[PDB]
Amino acid sequence: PVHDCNTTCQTPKGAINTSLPFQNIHPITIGKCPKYVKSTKLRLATGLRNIPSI
Amino acid sequence: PGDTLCIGYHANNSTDTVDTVLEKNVTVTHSVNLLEDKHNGKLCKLRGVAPLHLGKCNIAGWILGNPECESLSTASSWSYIVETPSSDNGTCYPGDFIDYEELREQLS
Amino acid sequence: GLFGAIAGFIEGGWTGMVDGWYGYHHQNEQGSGYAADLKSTQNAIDGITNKVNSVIEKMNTQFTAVGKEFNHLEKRIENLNKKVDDGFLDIWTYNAELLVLLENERTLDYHDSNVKNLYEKVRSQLKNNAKEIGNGCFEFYHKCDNTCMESVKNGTYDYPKYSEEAKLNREEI
Amino acid sequence: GLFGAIAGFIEGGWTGMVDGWYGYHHQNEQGSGYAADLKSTQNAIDGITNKVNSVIEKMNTQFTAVGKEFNHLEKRIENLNKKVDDGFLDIWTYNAELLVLLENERTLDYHDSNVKNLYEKVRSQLKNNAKEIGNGCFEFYHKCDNTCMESVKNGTYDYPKYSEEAKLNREEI
Amino acid sequence: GLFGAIAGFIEGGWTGMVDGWYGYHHQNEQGSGYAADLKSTQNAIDGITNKVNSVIEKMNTQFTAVGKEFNHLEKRIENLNKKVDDGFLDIWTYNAELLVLLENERTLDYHDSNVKNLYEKVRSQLKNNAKEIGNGCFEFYHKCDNTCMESVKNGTYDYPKYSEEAKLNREEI
Amino acid sequence: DDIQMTQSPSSLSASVGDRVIITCRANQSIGGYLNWYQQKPGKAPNLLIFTASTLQSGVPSRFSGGGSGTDFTLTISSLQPEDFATYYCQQNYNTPRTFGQGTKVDIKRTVAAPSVFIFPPSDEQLKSGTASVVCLLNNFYPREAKVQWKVDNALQSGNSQESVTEQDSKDSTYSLSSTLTLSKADYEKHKVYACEVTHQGLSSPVTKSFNRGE
Amino acid sequence: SQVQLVQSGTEVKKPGSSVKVSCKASGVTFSSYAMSWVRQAPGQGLEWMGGFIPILGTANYAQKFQGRLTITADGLTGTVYMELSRLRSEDTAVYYCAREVTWKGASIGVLGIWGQGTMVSVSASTKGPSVFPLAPSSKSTSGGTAALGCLVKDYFPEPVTVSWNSGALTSGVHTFPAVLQSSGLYSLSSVVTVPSSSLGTQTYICNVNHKPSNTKVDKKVEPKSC
Amino acid sequence: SQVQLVQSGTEVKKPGSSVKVSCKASGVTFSSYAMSWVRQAPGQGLEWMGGFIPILGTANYAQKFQGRLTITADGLTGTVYMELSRLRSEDTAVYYCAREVTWKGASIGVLGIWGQGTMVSVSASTKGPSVFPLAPSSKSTSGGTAALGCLVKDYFPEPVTVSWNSGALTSGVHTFPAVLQSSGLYSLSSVVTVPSSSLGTQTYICNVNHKPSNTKVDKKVEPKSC
Ligand SMILES: *[C@@H]1O[C@H](CO)[C@@H](O[C@@H]2O[C@H](CO)[C@@H](O)[C@H](O)[C@H]2NC(C)=O)[C@H](O)[C@H]1NC(C)=O
Ligand SMILES: *[C@@H]1O[C@H](CO)[C@@H](O)[C@H](O)[C@H]1NC(C)=O
Ligand SMILES: *[C@@H]1O[C@H](CO)[C@@H](O)[C@H](O)[C@H]1NC(C)=O
Ligand SMILES: *[C@@H]1O[C@H](CO)[C@@H](O)[C@H](O)[C@H]1NC(C)=O
Ligand SMILES: [Mg+2]
Ligand SMILES: [Mg+2]
Incomplete structure (x- = not known):
């Protein structure tokens, strides 16, 4: 469906945000869009190993 | 005994998990996601301008004047063209649209 | 871990x-509390900042x-x-997943080394x-006291000041 | 090595x-023999397993x-x-060789750290x-005795139990 | 650093x-001077040589x-x-910059470990x-003396030779 | 706890080519976690020094930060016309990024006496229930001056607002306007309104005053 | 390279409301550098409000802004938003955004790249100014030159353009900066030192324009009250 | 994701022979996870036989299987084969293959993903069953209901389908599981508790089919031996 929303990246499945460098929703896009990858999880560790009390 | 001093690291209530080369699902105090896995599920306006919708009638019928392509979006600007997969109405009289693929991007 | 500090002798x-991210816990007559080490934490934050920026800055x-x-005639080019879209897709997906997996372990080991050097600095002091x-x-x-505790954390600790005070207790046992 | 344990103070x-992969050798009155450390070996095997899987799982x-x-007319596309087959061939060959060379050294250093932490755990105990x-x-x-030997390996070692027994021999020399 | 030797306890x-690259400084009655450690320097030079060769040898x-x-008709293929030239250009530029940034830190940490093992070898001796x-x-x-100084550097140092000489000065304080 | 960044001095006047040394002290010892900034009127601040000794890329070598621990400094070897702005010091030690109070650099010229002037409230202004008295000082150097709103030979405090202009390009002087805002009823309860002005150029305090009827 | 931080435009907000200010970067997209927000009251010093660290994903604020400040970031785009609620006239200042980075890479303590600034004004409603002539009596004459001016009082928001004799009288004109009274409205006085030999020759008029209130006034500074 | 281990089909082998069982995975090809083989005798517990570690490239076996077990892997494909030589009737069991992995990555000690199982039967040759009626005498009558059944004895290999009255008699039918005798052949008895008022009214026949031996028999359970 074509709703009256606003976007900078449009895919056949739906519009997506360009706040992250990668996407996996659809390989076909129009506009300034991130790089499509078949990955399901790309999370970069920055903190330490979270070890609570025990 | 007496006075003591210790050295330790920081912990919090984070549930984020990361995958390393040697280990999987490692809990981390902080992390950053590089992959957007969410879509709003609707076709929005690109760069402010709304797209051009056509419905069950395709581009060929729309630009030629198919009688089913009579009442629809008559706009002066559009960011892109949306065609439904069920688009069947179109070149009702049998024939071949010469350079149809070229015209589709020209009218995009 | 790689340096044996996190999940090593310091279990939790x-x-x-x-x-x-890294700090000390003191227990003296005046009181007890937590206090993070400024030198190690701020340098680590900038280092991880540069690590993240080193990956996403070029990915514009x-x-x-x-x-x-x-x-129909444009079949071979199609x-x-x-071929090219699939080739780029397979390469980028493999490299992105592999880089994240490798760098995450290095990031975890980076915290391990930072904790270990903090312990050694206190141990040598x-x-x-x-x-x-x-x-x-x-x-x-x-x-x-509190002044003695901060002296170790600031790095301005004096062994001779309490050398004889500790030596009596060392030779006591 | 990177940690100086393998081909370092432990030469062979x-x-x-x-x-x-890593273990202890004891020599007491009852006898002598080899015994591998379970904690270090099993974790190392799983870690290297994940390292290998991290490379070949996505390569389907x-x-x-x-x-x-x-x-004859299809010359330009040919x-x-x-161009594309050679481009992918050059990239994949370079990345595969480079990754193996880099990861092999990290794998060797991984064993170096695991041995070093085992030595430090005994040394601190x-x-x-x-x-x-x-x-x-x-x-x-x-x-x-055998019970004392296993206590160090299991990590349940008691310094006070043999503190005075060792102290007499320390002050002997 | 990662090992805490360069820009660590050795500040400069x-x-x-x-x-x-790595060596010792002695100060005895006969004189003082600098002298590099042959074992650490030559191995490091070959290792960095192999690291550089591992990157540029395949890049022919x-x-x-x-x-x-x-x-005009050859528009789609154009x-x-x-597409392919830009795709290869983006991949090669990203990989080259990323590899240099990652390997440079590993190279810096390699010197840190080499210095640390040299200190530990002297400390254990x-x-x-x-x-x-x-x-x-x-x-x-x-x-x-000079013979004693070189004995530590060559690795043929004898603790029992100066054990009692040092012990008198240890028990002096 | 928090940190307090106090600079010394707060305002200095120097000529082109004169050595300028601005110091910054701290609540507690901060080692080398200090930075220096420069702000021009109507523009955003610009960084010059970080880690108290590392010059920012693009900053001229004439700027030389220094200090370690509790006391720091910012030295300009050759003061140039483009270095006439305000300077601040900021710390990186603790979470509150405490700034300094600032230090303004002024160009040097001959000491010029002001032109003290007084303006009574307007007739139409006196019909709206408000009365404003304006005291004007024109083309004086240096900036340091004191304005005393004396009413019925009694100085008034808490009712005066001062506005000053930047150094004019030609005369290199300032201008000050002090406004005394008070109600119409309070205006007609007194006769003589005065403006006492003290300044370096004036050997004796020059004061101007007016009566209500005139 | 040559990265520039572009903030949102100047916003005029009623007291007790909430204003959101954006801080967008240029050049390399998808950056994770730490960002900070700093305000500066007109004529006052710099004041640090808070900052965001995308690595930690959290933000830290000063004590006075705890509960009113809400610093957010749009993923890794490098754009950082600032939200301040329950605005008062004391919060009227120029708000800056800065990237925490040096040539040595990321630097959490420094502010290498600054924004363009965003002016925020707070008062109950838009109010037109009023011009009151400053009497050019003989008491305002000293050294052969006289003194006269116009008093602009109780206007919001800034700025106000004041010209003399339809822009003809330029030299000697000193337009003083506005001062925020305790009433929440600004006031300024533009004066000019004219020679004493022109009071009876040239009529003097100040042209005051306030586009926010769409008010334009031209008031004659009549010599003396007569 | 949702990886499933598919083993080879059930194999019937003569004693003293060697059987090879495959264990192929699905989804991500080229895996190096450690694998293990576990057998379970019918009605008994689980018994660990051995395992393979592709990282080490070697295998380790239990003491009882040292010399008879040969666990191999087809490179890194994830398929692992099991070879057992000198098979006996005591080795007749269901053989499982399991991948050693958790959600925390590789786990050498655990068996997260299991196979479908592979039944192996061992006896000298295929032998047809025999049906012996269980006499429904008055001694088998208690509580108004009687008891009768059919005894299937000395058949190999399993399974055997037993139905009553061409499948008509369903309720009250208890077909007992087979038991491996010391002779190496199985035996089972299917019984049914019929009311005492039906011995002289309805004839009872058990339909026994043994497809491996292609033997089908229908034996009347004649009331009493007369
Ligand atoms: C794209 O970004 C917008 C803005 O962040 C998201 O909208 C938010 O969604 C959350 C989740 O329900 C709400 O709580 C917020 O109120 C929404 N607005 C804002 C300003 O945060 C949106 O969900 C994102 N969509 C995708 C597909 O990424
Ligand atoms: C720093 O100054 C502040 C404000 O004067 C004060 O609250 C704080 O206690 C000071 N820090 C000290 C004294 O360590
Ligand atoms: C290094 O410094 C130079 C100038 O000193 C600067 O141009 C360059 O951008 C810096 N490099 C980085 C990565 O910041
Ligand atoms: C991490 O755990 C989740 C569920 O707890 C699981 O779905 C996911 O596959 C696990 N990740 C890995 C790498 O095993
Ligand atoms: Mg709707
Ligand atoms: Mg945290």
């Missing part, structure tokens, strides 16, 4: 430390388009277009004026 | 140790074909097909009740 | 050491050409040629016959 972390946004569809009781703790053989 | 490995098999040959004679060995200053 | 380097020169220009005064220095508790 402190939930009460909410001001930094691209203008995309559906492009011209392929007619297959070539499928105190020398014989404290006892290594394990789990990253140091039972002082002398009297350490 | 044990051929008699056939049950694990592909359906291949000879494809249509190129006629050159483009040669025994403290003054043993003498660091080099080459990863520890001459006990007290009487260590 | 020696400008007078012009014969090797390519024969290039302007190629046929594209006519776009495909632009001297044991109680010297005092760890910090900054990688060792105040000898006994008399060390």
Whole structure:
């Protein structure tokens, strides 16, 4: 469906945000869009190993 | 005994998990996601301008004047063209649209 | 871990430390509390900042388009277009997943080294004026007030000041 | 090495140790023999397992074909097909060789750290009740039976139990 | 650093050491001077040599050409040629910059480990016959002539030779 | 706890080519976690020094930060016309990024006496229930001056607002306007309104005053 | 390279409301550098409000802004938003955004790249100014030159353009900066030192324009009250 | 994701022979996870036989299987084969293959994903069953209901389908599981508790089919031996 929303990246499945460098929703896009990858999880560790009390 | 001093690291209530080369699902105090896995599920306006919708009638019928392509979006600007997969109405009289693929991007 | 500090002799972390990544816990007559080490935390934050920036800065946004569809005669080129898009897709997906997996372990080991150097700096500073009781703790053989505690953290610690005070307790046992 | 344990103070490995990657050798009144450390070996095996899986899991098999040959008119596209196949071939060959060379050194350093942490765990446990004679060995200053030997390996070692027994031999020299 | 030796307890380097990457500075009755450690320097040079060769050896020169220009009808293939050249350009630029940034930190950490193992080899050799005064220095508790100094550097150091000589000075304080 | 960044001095006047040394002290010892900034009127601040000794890329070598621990400094070897702005010091030690109070640099010229002037409230203004008295000082150097709103030979405090202009390009002087805002009823309860002005150029305090009826 | 931080435009907000200010970067997209927000009251010093660290994903604020400040970031785009609620006239200032980075890479303590600034004004409603002539009596004459001016009082928001004699009288004109009274409205006085030999020759008029209130006034500074 | 281990089909082998069982995975090809083989005798517990570690490239076996077990892997495909020589009737069991992995990555000690199982039967040759009626005498009558059944004895290999009255008699039918005798052949008895008022009214026949031996028999359970 074509709703009256606003976007900078449009895919056949739906519009997506360009706040992250990668996407996996659809390989076909129009506009300034991130790089499509078949990955399901790309999370970069920055903190330490979270070890609570025990 | 007496006075003591210790050295330790920081912990919090984070549930984020990361995958390393040697280990999987490692809990981390902080992390950053590089992959957007969410879509709003609707076709929005690109760069402010709304797209051009056509419905069950395709581009060929729309630009030629198919009688089913009579009442629809008559706009002066559009960011892109949306065609439904069920688009069947179109070149009702049998024939071949010469350079149809070229015209589709020209009218995009 | 790689350096044996996190999940090593220091088995767990402190939930009460909410001001930094690495720090100290003191227990003297005046009181007890947590205090993060400024030098290690700030340098680590900038280092991880540069690590993240080293990955995503060059990965800039691209203008995309559906492009011209392929007619019946344009079959061979259509297959070539499928070949190149799939080739780039397979390479980028493999490299992105592999880089994240490799860098995450290096990031975890980076914290391990930072904690270890903090322990060694305290261990080298105190020398014989404290006892290594394990789990990253140091039972002082002398009297350490708040000024003495901060002196170790600031790096301006004086072994001769409490050398004889500790030596009497060392020779006591 | 990177951690200085393998090919460092421990110059060579044990051929008699056939049950694990890292372990201990004891020499008491009852007897002598080899015994691998379970905690270090099993974790290392899983870690290297994940490292290998991290490389080959995503490298899945592909359906291949000879494809249509190129006629005289299909010269430009034929050159483009040669361009893309050679481009992917050069990239994959370079990345595969480079990754193996880099990861192999990290794998070797991984064993170096695992051995070093095992030595430090024993060194911190025994403290003054043993003498660091080099080459990863520890001459006990007290009487260590089989129960005492396993206590160090299991991590449930008691310094106070043999504190006075070792102290007499320490002050002897 | 990662190992805490360079820019760690050893804050700065020696400008007078012009014969090797890692070495010693002695101060005895006969005189003082700099002397690089042969074992650590030569191995490090070969290792960094192999690291550089591991990157550039496979990156061989390519024969290039302007190629046929594209006519009006050759528009779709011209776009495909632009697609593949840009795709390879983006991948190679990203991988080259990323590899250099990652390997440079590993190279810096490689020197950190090499310095640390040199310090530990001296620290384990001297044991109680010297005092760890910090900054990688060792105040000898006994008399060390030129022969004694080289013995530590060559690795053929004898603790029992100066054990009683140092012990008198240890028990002096 | 928090940190307090105090600079010394707060305002200095120097000529082109004169050495300028601005110091910054701290609540507690901060080692080298200090930075220096420069702000021009109507523009955003610009960084010059970080870690108290590392010059920012693009800053001229004439700027030389220094200090370690509790006391720091910012030295300009050759003061140039483009270095006439305000300077601040900021710390990186603790979470509150405490700034300094600032230090303004002024160009040097001959000491010029002001032109004290007084303006009574307007007739139409006196019909709206408000009365404003304006005291004007024109083309004086240096900036340091004191304005005393004396009413019925009694100085008034808490009712005066001062506005000053930047150094004019030609005369290199300032201009000050002090406004005394008070109600119409309070205006007609007194006769003589005065403006006492003290300044370096004036050997004796020059004061101007007016009566209500005139 | 040559990265520039572009903030949102100047916003005029009623008291007790909430204003959101954006801080967008240029050049390399998808950056994770730490960002900070700093305000500066007109004529006052710099004041640090808070900052965001995308690595930690959290933000830290000063004590006075705890509960009113809400610093958010749009993923890794490098754009950082600032939200301040329960605005008062004391919060009227120029708000800056800065990237924490040096040539040595990321630097958490420094502010290498600054924004363009965003002016925020707070008062109950838009109010037109009023011009009151400053009497050019003989008491305002000294050294052969006289003194006269116009008093602009109780206007909001800034700025106000004041010209003399339809822009003809330029030299000697000193337009003083506005001062925020305790009433929440600004006031300024533009004066000019004219020679004493022109009071009876040239009529003097100040042209005051306030586009926010669409008010334009031209008031004659009549010599003396007569 | 949702990886499933598919083993080879059930194999019937003569004693003293060697059987090879495959264990192929699905989804991600080229895996190096450690694998293990576990057998379970019918009605008994689980018994660990051995395992393979592709990282080490070697295998380790239990003491009882040292010399008879040969666990091999087809490169890194994830398929692992099991070879057992000198098979006996005591080795007749269901053989499982399991992948050693958790959600925390590789786990050498655990068996997260299991196979479908592979039944192996061992006896000298295929032998047809025999049906012996269980006499429904008055001694088998208690509580108003009687008891009768059919005894299937000395058949190999399993399974055998037993139905009553061409499948008509369903309720009250208890077909007992087979038991491996010391002779190496199985035996089972299917019984049914019919009311006492039906011995002289309805004839009872058990339909026994043994497809491996292609033997089908229908034996009347004649009331009493008369
Ligand atoms: C794209 O970004 C917008 C803005 O962040 C998201 O909208 C938010 O969604 C959350 C989740 O329900 C709400 O709580 C917020 O109120 C929404 N607005 C804002 C300003 O945060 C949106 O969900 C995102 N969509 C995708 C597909 O990424
Ligand atoms: C720093 O100054 C502040 C404000 O004067 C004060 O609250 C704080 O206690 C000071 N820090 C000290 C004294 O360590
Ligand atoms: C290094 O410094 C130079 C100038 O000193 C600067 O141009 C360059 O951008 C810096 N490099 C980085 C990565 O910041
Ligand atoms: C991490 O755990 C989740 C569920 O707890 C699981 O779905 C996911 O596959 C796990 N990740 C890995 C790498 O095993
Ligand atoms: Mg709707
Ligand atoms: Mg945290």
